């Protein structure tokens, strides 16, 4: 049986150097995908520029409870359980407790309908911070706006004490694996090396390998605690040996084309 | 639960004017979906200006058996009972009496693939003069090649009597609510202020204000009837109050991605 | 009822001038779908080009296991069944007997993958020398990938000895008749008008003539050995005559979104 | 020699539905040119569409002096001598006693520059209400920017009593003829066939017809008492008659790149 | 001086095969620029192809006085000297003795006018069958056209006997060197390294090659004798070898733009 | 007169990163203006994405003989004196000591006809590290190919000691003054604004502030020891302050458009 790969790059729209580096990394290296935030001011802009200079590139929604200085698309007073006092996002160390979870279905079906603005239909959904995969309940929405929506979403396992998430998908299509290994002090050429081979001995039939390449703005700076790394991402997701790799190993890179309901 | 308002201009592909009139409106203003003649012979290049110049508007497919001026897709042997002694469809004044339904469905058919010849699916069906919505009989037939091809088909009621025909639609989707109200001396900015209480009153989810933006060209003088008005919906819906009102109800903005089928 | 005419231009991307020629035959001619090579190494450049140069062209995927000079999408040691000592692709006049099943099924998946790198989806599927339909077995490999992708299939039967295939497509949407006819010693005007009284006089709903049209380029005449009478076909799909006879029979040009599943 | 006709809507970018209406009258007619006004909030737009929507329309820049309702590019405090007590252009009826023709000079040095905000350089020089022409002063002024900008200029006469002012022009090159009289009352279809007459009957190698075609939007009704006759002008330049017309002649359409030095 | 050679596709517009040939013998070779026919009644979809499919494509007009099948710009009353009984251009074998030299500049003088259409200004004029070099006095009208239009002209000198040609040019910029050998018989990769060689021999610093790259369609079949060569000169200009044999030589690809006055 | 002020960025194409945080620049701020490295082999990469996403950049040339890690567009065999050992351009620290005035023109030539492969022609010419001001031989050469090339050059001095440069510019149009503060250390806003204030307290018309916004990538960060502080060039010209400053103080943004020959 072939290996199906998703590569795909986290934070399109995050903010404008992002966007391009992501565009980057898929037009002259191995990114099939990437998945948007609609809560960015610059989101619309982004789905512009992919529209125009990287027409081949996958795009699904990226949700969000905890982005750092943004607020949710519903006002505060639909959604109060979401925000700090301002009106912003919770951080992701203290989410979990705050949240009410219709509040979150509400703001994140406005997300969807946030990025059909853009024109176009997300091909899948998965979440900033994974948190989607922070515990079932809040799994039990995304899979609910999963099949509202007809789309598949991201496998929300990282461990194998979450391992049991995934027998709460059945209709709601997702990867067999989710490799988050490639990130902060793992970026490296070895790292995805690793991770093919990983592909190659499993068992499964669609494999994702996310990442978060851009290219360093001050913008990014500015929001970011991760921003620095993001760079050597792009670096290594566009060189000749990580490309050689999935093709000596028969990998076909694919898309959530793959999985569609 | 959020309410989801999908902001329709009808009769794109009318004429040149009408055609950029509707993206005007969308690119400058509130309108966020346009339904297209492919009885028109600017269809085709209204579809072209949408591709390069409005890429984010949503388009669905406008059936007619009225339009002025207007032949049908099918030659008149095909579609007799639909036709004037010229070959022209019928005055929406005496229509209604003269259809055969067989041909209604065919000519309606014909309609929908031709709408496909500019390469696009369209994202849902409503009519020209609402004659979907002039009977149960003409209802049905729409909702046939709603089921054939699978798309959401606009809430044909705009009466209290007539709201038993949304029982018919069921595996059919449909706004919850259609608010037609916004046309000739009900043009203005407290009609729009009006319409969008009502949808933060209701129960619904999902809710559809229609409208006419148009520029003006001698092609639409010598065709509608109702011609100079729709320069005042372009003002209207490209108002910065506009804009601002729906912000305040916390209304998303959307389209009939909201819903497929 | 209306017939449905798809017209569909099979080779896409299997060298620039057959690319080219394909186009013309769609902007100036009746031609309003085509099917493309993903096992060429022009594939994607094709696929741009329409992207930019004929937005309005409908486009399926080209499956093959006989391809001239080509090798599959999977490394020969996946595959082994499907190519010659050097990795290339078996003749069709020897493959039948060669292949085994489950390697076909991988590598046309590979194939339909392969595709959507384009960032597309293809609208149906069908196959380079008819090889879907050289015997059940082989159809019933493409069957099982039209119900894995939910994708409309061609119909194989191009003899009355074949036509208990359609018995198997079943939920696979297929159109009604297959007109094969138009090619080399047949290319002609007078063809044409033979087949399109054929669709005007049976009992279908949906017929597809397919064809070859294409610019000659040295690619071409060293991968094909039919090759000159490709511009003629160019010729004969872009003629007035041709033009007039469809209309002058009612017929519809449709592509295989009209056969979505 | 040949008669070169160069036909040029004034007024581009002053409104959106000017602009529109405008690309039709190109597109579907016989306008070849047009002149901008750098002094409209819409120019930059009007460039973009026409950019992607009419990359074969000849723009060059439309100077002003007089503009309803508009003010000078440069602060009021640099161009005294150009506007009433609020900031305003002087009203055409006016503005001769009252201007500096240092101030006239910067003013449109810096209209120019503006129009190059666009990424384009103009292909000519005009005038609104051909203030240009107003006396031989201001006309001066426009050959010195001609002269530094290199573009030609429209010819400024429009009455046997000013044709001794093409003798200042020296290298600046410009149409052997102002043909001024389609407007308002004499807009038919009767006047352009005069025009064309004129062209043939006269001595001159080069002429030019100016124009006002529109749409009409709200902007266009309140900015300016010349307004619905505008979309007869568009009907009347997309006539077959006037095609013919021009062809039955064997009069050559031009632009001002037949005029550049 | 660093050696600067331009090699330019003669034809481009001819058919629509041609036009799409010659964009490939740039975008995948060696072809750095090409000259359009306005006579011809593809011209005006050869450069809206050019302009969204090869934007680096450098383009000049191909004037002509002799094209098969084709007739002047301006009807026949105006240059009668120019064309048979039948209005069509004179053969090359004997046009020479029948053309009056004002009806030659009117006719060119139309002919890039014609291109303008457009919207495009050429880079450099040249000459179908060479006649600009035909005798002193074509050449003659050629540079009046040249001057007018500030535009260099293709050497007109393909024998050590028209050497004194040049003298002519003046402030007319030109190649030093016209290397036409690329032809028919001496199609070859052979051919074109033993031009490579002339280039590197020879005391000019800029030199021309011509060529005629074409995909093959019925038009061109019909229209021309000189047809299925061209798509070998299309091979030979995308070959490894002759990109390699230039860069080894140290040869610099320019366009016309080198030229410019 | 008016003051005309260009902010140009140098270094256009150096790197994928620092194109896109031109544009951005551009886009999204006060940059008016960009000069291009055709030495660079993102190059044409760079004049693609402007063409596609930022249609209104003004782009010129930046000649070199000095950049790090790179080589000339000439063979080392022809401009021997320009480069190391290893076939590198000289650093420019003793670069002045070691060219060959014959071989820096030859050179630079190359380097015009190279930025000309992109299909367009440069609207003006400087110099990385400022090479063409570094003395007036240097300058002389720049200054004869801007004669060759009808080009606006760059104002090459930056000392109060080098201002009889300017005297031998002649025909050759140029800004009035050289603002280069904007660099390293001086990197803030304040700057900006003291580079406004000098605009304003100066006698010159024209004057250029050059900048080296980017984003940040691995082959910037590789490539050049000024890297980090290219971002807060891009936040500061893109900042409302910024904006607002130059409005305020009446100055007109400019390209070079408003210095061409």
Redesign the interface.
Known sequence: ??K?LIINADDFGYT??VT??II?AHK?GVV?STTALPTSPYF?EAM??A???A????IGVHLTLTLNQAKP???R??VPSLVDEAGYFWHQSIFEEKVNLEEVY?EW??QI??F????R?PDHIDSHHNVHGKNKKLLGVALALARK??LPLRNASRSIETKDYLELYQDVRTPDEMLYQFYDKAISTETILQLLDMVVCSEGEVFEINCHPA????IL?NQSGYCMPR??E??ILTSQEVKEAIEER?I????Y??L?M
Request: without cysteine; charged residues 25%; negative net charge.
């Open positions: 049986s072939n199906k404008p150097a391009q580096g980057e002259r099939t619309l512009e520029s529209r125009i200079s027409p081949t590139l996958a698309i519903l006002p007073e639909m509400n079906d406005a309908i946030s059909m603005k853009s024109g239909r929506y007809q290219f360093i703005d001050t700076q760079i050597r792009v670096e028969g076909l890179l694919a898309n084309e793959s569609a």
